[PDB]
Amino acid sequence: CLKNVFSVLLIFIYLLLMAVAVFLVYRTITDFREKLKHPVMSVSYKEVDRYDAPGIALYPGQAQLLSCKHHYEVIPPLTSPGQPGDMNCTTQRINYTDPFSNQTVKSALIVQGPREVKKRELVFLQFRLNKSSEDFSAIDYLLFSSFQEFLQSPNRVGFMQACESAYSSWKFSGGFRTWVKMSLVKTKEEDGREAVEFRQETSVVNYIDQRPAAKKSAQLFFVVFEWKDPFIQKVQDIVTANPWNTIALLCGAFLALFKAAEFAKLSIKWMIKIRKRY
Amino acid sequence: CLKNVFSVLLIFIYLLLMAVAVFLVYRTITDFREKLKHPVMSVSYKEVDRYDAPGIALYPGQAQLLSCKHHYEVIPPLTSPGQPGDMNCTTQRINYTDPFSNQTVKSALIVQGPREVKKRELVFLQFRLNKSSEDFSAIDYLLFSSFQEFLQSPNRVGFMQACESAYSSWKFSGGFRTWVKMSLVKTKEEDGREAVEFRQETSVVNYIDQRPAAKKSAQLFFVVFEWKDPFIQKVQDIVTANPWNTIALLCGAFLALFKAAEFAKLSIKWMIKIRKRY
Amino acid sequence: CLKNVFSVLLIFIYLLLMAVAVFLVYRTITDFREKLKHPVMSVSYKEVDRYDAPGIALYPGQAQLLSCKHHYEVIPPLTSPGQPGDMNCTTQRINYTDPFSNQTVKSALIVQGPREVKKRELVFLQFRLNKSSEDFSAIDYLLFSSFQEFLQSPNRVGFMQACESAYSSWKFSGGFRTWVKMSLVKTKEEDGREAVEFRQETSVVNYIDQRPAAKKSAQLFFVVFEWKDPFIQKVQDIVTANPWNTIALLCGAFLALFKAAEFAKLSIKWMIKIRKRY
Numbered sequence: 001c002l003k004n005v006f007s008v009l010l011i012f013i014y015l016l017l018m019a020v021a022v023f024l025v026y027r028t029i030t031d032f033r034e035k036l037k038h039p040v041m042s043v044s045y046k047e048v049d050r051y052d053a054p055g056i057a058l059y060p061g062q063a064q065l066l067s068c069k070h071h072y073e074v075i076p077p078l079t080s081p082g083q084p085g086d087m088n089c090t091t092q093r094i095n096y097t098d099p100f101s102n103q104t105v106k107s108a109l110i111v112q113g114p115r116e117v118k119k120r121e122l123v124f125l126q127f128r129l130n131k132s133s134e135d136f137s138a139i140d141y142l143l144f145s146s147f148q149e150f151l152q153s154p155n156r157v158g159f160m161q162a163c164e165s166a167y168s169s170w171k172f173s174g175g176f177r178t179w180v181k182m183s184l185v186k187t188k189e190e191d192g193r194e195a196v197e198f199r200q201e202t203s204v205v206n207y208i209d210q211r212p213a214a215k216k217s218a219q220l221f222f223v224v225f226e227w228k229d230p231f232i233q234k235v236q237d238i239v240t241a242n243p244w245n246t247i248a249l250l251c252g253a254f255l256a257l258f259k260a261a262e263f264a265k266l267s268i269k270w271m272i273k274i275r276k277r278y
Numbered sequence: 279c280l281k282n283v284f285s286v287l288l289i290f291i292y293l294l295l296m297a298v299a300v301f302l303v304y305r306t307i308t309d310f311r312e313k314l315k316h317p318v319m320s321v322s323y324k325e326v327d328r329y330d331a332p333g334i335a336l337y338p339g340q341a342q343l344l345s346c347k348h349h350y351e352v353i354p355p356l357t358s359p360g361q362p363g364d365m366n367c368t369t370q371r372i373n374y375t376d377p378f379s380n381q382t383v384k385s386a387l388i389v390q391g392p393r394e395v396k397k398r399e400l401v402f403l404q405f406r407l408n409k410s411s412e413d414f415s416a417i418d419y420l421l422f423s424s425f426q427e428f429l430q431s432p433n434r435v436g437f438m439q440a441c442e443s444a445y446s447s448w449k450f451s452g453g454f455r456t457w458v459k460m461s462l463v464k465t466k467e468e469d470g471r472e473a474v475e476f477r478q479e480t481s482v483v484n485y486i487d488q489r490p491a492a493k494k495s496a497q498l499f500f501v502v503f504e505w506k507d508p509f510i511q512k513v514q515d516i517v518t519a520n521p522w523n524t525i526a527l528l529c530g531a532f533l534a535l536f537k538a539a540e541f542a543k544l545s546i547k548w549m550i551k552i553r554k555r556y
Numbered sequence: 557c558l559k560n561v562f563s564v565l566l567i568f569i570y571l572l573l574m575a576v577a578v579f580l581v582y583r584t585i586t587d588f589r590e591k592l593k594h595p596v597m598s599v600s601y602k603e604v605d606r607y608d609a610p611g612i613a614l615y616p617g618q619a620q621l622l623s624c625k626h627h628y629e630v631i632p633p634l635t636s637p638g639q640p641g642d643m644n645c646t647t648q649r650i651n652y653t654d655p656f657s658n659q660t661v662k663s664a665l666i667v668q669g670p671r672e673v674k675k676r677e678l679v680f681l682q683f684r685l686n687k688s689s690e691d692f693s694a695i696d697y698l699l700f701s702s703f704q705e706f707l708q709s710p711n712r713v714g715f716m717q718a719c720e721s722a723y724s725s726w727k728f729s730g731g732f733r734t735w736v737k738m739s740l741v742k743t744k745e746e747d748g749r750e751a752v753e754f755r756q757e758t759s760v761v762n763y764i765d766q767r768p769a770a771k772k773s774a775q776l777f778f779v780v781f782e783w784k785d786p787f788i789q790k791v792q793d794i795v796t797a798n799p800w801n802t803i804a805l806l807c808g809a810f811l812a813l814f815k816a817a818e819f820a821k822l823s824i825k826w827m828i829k830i831r832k833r834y
């Protein structure tokens with residue numbers, strides 16, 4: 001009457017293997033949910049021959065700018081303060097309404113930044129704020145990726161608001177030269193898009209005002225816009241769980257368990273033979 | 279007498295397949311050891327409606343602070359130097375012993391930072407150090423994540439040492455306004471923990487001292503504490519090698535090799551038939 | 557005459573499964589090409605007992621340096637400006653030709669940085685530039701990983717050019733103390749190499765010149781070189797697609813499809829039996 005016992009015994013292999021099968025599909029499902037929740041990042045650096053001329057959206061307001069001078073040389077030659085002119089920018093002043101507020105027009109000024117990173121070209125601006133009641137001399141600016149696109153785009157009055165919302169506006173101080181070493185990051189969201197963001201590393205250098213040494217003491221600002229490295233750090237969140245390399249593995253495990261059940265039927269046959277031997 | 283030769287020939291399939299099997303399990307084992315050694319990082323940005331009020335653990339020492347003023351406006355209105363008062367902080371001065379030393383009590387001061395990032399709220403502090411022998415005016419500070427937790431926690435005298443050991447204490451200078459744009463990173467170690475770290479980007483703005491223009495020339499410090507972006511960069515090291523999606527693949531490869539050995543037995547049968555045909 | 561119809565019907569399982577097989581190998585091939593294009597990054601922090609003494613390649617030019625003083629104390633004690641001496645560096649002045657130009661010899665100066673991060677040792681330099689026509693007082697520097705290697709290496713005149721090309725040269729300003737908190741990143745390119753890069757976070761602190769308060773007003777520079785954290789952020793791009801864990805999965809899927817074709821032959825047998833029943 002204990003033959004059905006041996007039957008359920010040989011079937012215990014089926015039972016345990018179906019149990020580990022449902023356990024494994026559960027674990028694989030929950031791990032796929034996890035790896036689908038938050039993907040994995042991946043950085044790659046693509047060295048570029050020469051950058052596309054960025055757009056420096058300075059917001060001087062009242063402070064008139066003195067000079068512009070690109071300098072392929074690693075060092076900007078000796079300047080002469082308080083003297084306007086010497087401008088050699090492809091500058092363009094453009095107005096728009098702050099998308100944050102729409103309550104105050106923020107006059108701007110656009111500059112074609114440096115292009116030749118290997119030649120180490122660098123825009124060197126100069127500004128002046130003849131004494132006012134600001135109490136903190138600061139001219140904030142902004143960087144978008146390619147200046148020619150701004151020149152050619154239609155209704156750039158709105159393209160500028162799009163930039164101001166996309167990028168971030170960090171100010172350069174007043175009273176010392178701020179060597180801004182720009183650098184790009186072409187980050188790619190997974191929804192088939194490419195987002196260009198500027199990450200810069202300022203380095204302020206104090207201005208020795210002993211050269212003018214006068215009674216005017218008018219505030220004057222200095223900037224240097226440079227390309228940090230000839231590379232473009234582009235980061236894209238890689239989806240580490242595709243719907244294919246997981247179902248194939250689940251099928252492989254299901255087949256492993258099926259083959260194991262077949263080997264278990266073979267082992268039950270061997271055990272029946274051994275019992276017949278006894 | 280050369281039949282055993284054909285036998286060992288048909289068995290050479292078994293031999294080579296068992297060899298590639300041990301090679302593949304070796305490679306999979308060593309790759310699992312590697313991917314278990316150092317996991318893969320993964321960044322995700324979770325935009326928050328409004329931040330939990332951080333805790334600014336300034337260490338003024340002797341320098342009394344003049345004013346506090348939150349400013350939902352993007353710009354702090356014009357200040358008046360040398361004049362105390364106007365404080366509207368939920369400030370709290372707290373003492374403790376430096377866990378690094380335990381040899382000197384470091385008087386502190388806690389401030390409830392800004393909360394509404396979308397409203398662009400910003401704490402604007404002011405300090406004074408009437409002329410002393412410091413030779414370098416610097417007031418270091420510290421940031422922990424949520425101020426109300428500090429208020430409610432028990433024995434915050436030790437919670438502060440825990441913070442000082444966990445976070446990092448970077449000083450803001452003296453003589454110009456330092457626009458500190460705080461930002462959080464809720465990093466998650468894999469051992470079921472969540473670590474909150476502050477990564478800020480200062481931006482100093484020189485102070486035009488021509489407004490006081492007196493013979494006192496007392497050192498005075500300005501700060502601005504702001505939330506950089508409404509996002510919270512949270513990074514978690516994803517374990518790229520789970521103990522399951524590797525053993526399933528090993529079993530799939532073992533079955534591929536078993537099926538290949540079966541097809542090889544079939545090919546040996548075909549070769550025996552071809553030999554019988556000849 | 558419609559028996560061949562049932563034949564092609566049972567064969568439609570073979571057809572659809574071979575179709576999904578070629579589709580799956582196509583998808584796996586293209587995903588392997590993708591994951592081979594750009595690998596996945598992975599950060600790990602290895603706390604070190606004590607750092608290997610870095611090499612600070614300052615480029616003073618004409619500015620003679622006043623003093624050196626390591627300070628295990630977290631704060632450098634009160635200095636005395638304008639007074640040379642007090643040097644306790646293992647300094648070494650070395651010349652070479654700028655690999656960028658080869659048109660101008662750039663005199664340098666090497667300093668053995670701090671070693672004991674847990675002891676919070678910190679090099680504190682001092683410089684002077686008696687009034688000149690620079691108009692912007694800046695002394696740029698440079699960091700390589702281990703100073704003893706520089707001392708022992710052969711023909712360091714070229715090792716220095718190698719460093720200048722490998723690392724990046726960021727200047728510390730003139731007129732205020734720049735607390736440079738160095739930190740290493742031992743990044744590993746996949747081609748069996750280990751690249752050591754310095755990523756530092758400066759923090760300038762204004763110099764109160766009321767202590768000299770003379771008519772000389774000579775430019776003088778202050779630096780502090782410190783180790784930020786006792787950790788060494790080492791990042792290595794993990795190849796997320798190995799040539800092995802993909803072919804094993806492809807074989808597992810091929811076997812899943814073979815077993816499915818066998819079950820389909822069984823289903824065709826069941827359908828033939830059902831048709832015979834009718």
Ligand SMILES: *[C@@H]1O[C@H](CO)[C@@H](O[C@@H]2O[C@H](CO)[C@@H](O)[C@H](O)[C@H]2NC(C)=O)[C@H](O)[C@H]1NC(C)=O
Nearest residue numbers: 061062092093094095096104105106107108109
């Ligand atoms: C862009 O906006 C600026 C600032 O509003 C304009 O500058 C003003 O132009 C008017 C023209 O009559 C002057 O009267 C004002 O004195 C200017 N500045 C202010 C407000 O004091 C500028 O005209 C606008 N764009 C351009 C270049 O036309």
Ligand SMILES: *[C@@H]1O[C@H](CO)[C@@H](O[C@@H]2O[C@H](CO)[C@@H](O)[C@H](O)[C@H]2NC(C)=O)[C@H](O)[C@H]1NC(C)=O
Nearest residue numbers: 339340370371372373374382383384385386387
């Ligand atoms: C926290 O520590 C500070 C600094 O030690 C304390 O400030 C001192 O308080 C005593 C009270 O009699 C004064 O006599 C000292 O002049 C204060 N500062 C020093 C050392 O000169 C403060 O009292 C402590 N906490 C509070 C708010 O009670």
Ligand SMILES: *[C@@H]1O[C@H](CO)[C@@H](O[C@@H]2O[C@H](CO)[C@@H](O)[C@H](O)[C@H]2NC(C)=O)[C@H](O)[C@H]1NC(C)=O
Nearest residue numbers: 617618648649650651652660661662663664665
């Ligand atoms: C490394 O280069 C510097 C700068 O060229 C050398 O300093 C010059 O040394 C000569 C020796 O006669 C002096 O006449 C010059 O006045 C020095 N500086 C300059 C150019 O004005 C230095 O000698 C070189 N290395 C060493 C330490 O010998």
Ligand SMILES: *[C@@H]1O[C@H](CO)[C@@H](O)[C@H](O)[C@H]1NC(C)=O
Nearest residue numbers: 068069070085086087088089
């Ligand atoms: C600006 O630079 C170009 C470079 O070729 C030069 O030709 C031009 O004369 C410069 N303009 C001025 C205003 O000097």
Ligand SMILES: *[C@@H]1O[C@H](CO)[C@@H](O)[C@H](O)[C@H]1NC(C)=O
Nearest residue numbers: 097098099100101102103104
């Ligand atoms: C622009 O400002 C107006 C108020 O003048 C406001 O009603 C509108 O919503 C703003 N535009 C947006 C969508 O930000």
Ligand SMILES: *[C@@H]1O[C@H](CO)[C@@H](O)[C@H](O)[C@H]1NC(C)=O
Nearest residue numbers: 062063064129130131216218
């Ligand atoms: C200072 O700037 C203003 C314009 O903002 C101008 O009217 C005034 O003449 C300037 N002074 C000098 C010295 O150029």
Ligand SMILES: *[C@@H]1O[C@H](CO)[C@@H](O)[C@H](O)[C@H]1NC(C)=O
Nearest residue numbers: 346347348363364365366367
């Ligand atoms: C602080 O700000 C709140 C905002 O409602 C205001 O009601 C309160 O009067 C302010 N306190 C002072 C000291 O002005």
Ligand SMILES: *[C@@H]1O[C@H](CO)[C@@H](O)[C@H](O)[C@H]1NC(C)=O
Nearest residue numbers: 375376377378379380381382
């Ligand atoms: C605190 O300082 C004391 C010396 O007063 C020292 O013995 C103790 O180890 C310190 N606590 C720790 C664990 O840092």
Ligand SMILES: *[C@@H]1O[C@H](CO)[C@@H](O)[C@H](O)[C@H]1NC(C)=O
Nearest residue numbers: 340341342407408409494496
């Ligand atoms: C300067 O600060 C000290 C307190 O540190 C105070 O005794 C002194 O009166 C202050 N001077 C002024 C001008 O308020």
Ligand SMILES: *[C@@H]1O[C@H](CO)[C@@H](O)[C@H](O)[C@H]1NC(C)=O
Nearest residue numbers: 624625626641642643644645
């Ligand atoms: C430099 O520091 C060491 C530390 O032991 C000291 O022995 C030596 O006297 C110092 N040198 C000078 C110039 O003081």
Ligand SMILES: *[C@@H]1O[C@H](CO)[C@@H](O)[C@H](O)[C@H]1NC(C)=O
Nearest residue numbers: 653654655656657658659660
């Ligand atoms: C070094 O400069 C010379 C010019 O004097 C130049 O010909 C050579 O290419 C430079 N070396 C390199 C490879 O940078």
Ligand SMILES: *[C@@H]1O[C@H](CO)[C@@H](O)[C@H](O)[C@H]1NC(C)=O
Nearest residue numbers: 618619620685686687772774
């Ligand atoms: C200033 O430095 C120069 C050397 O560069 C030296 O000749 C001159 O005597 C120095 N002056 C003082 C006050 O030491």
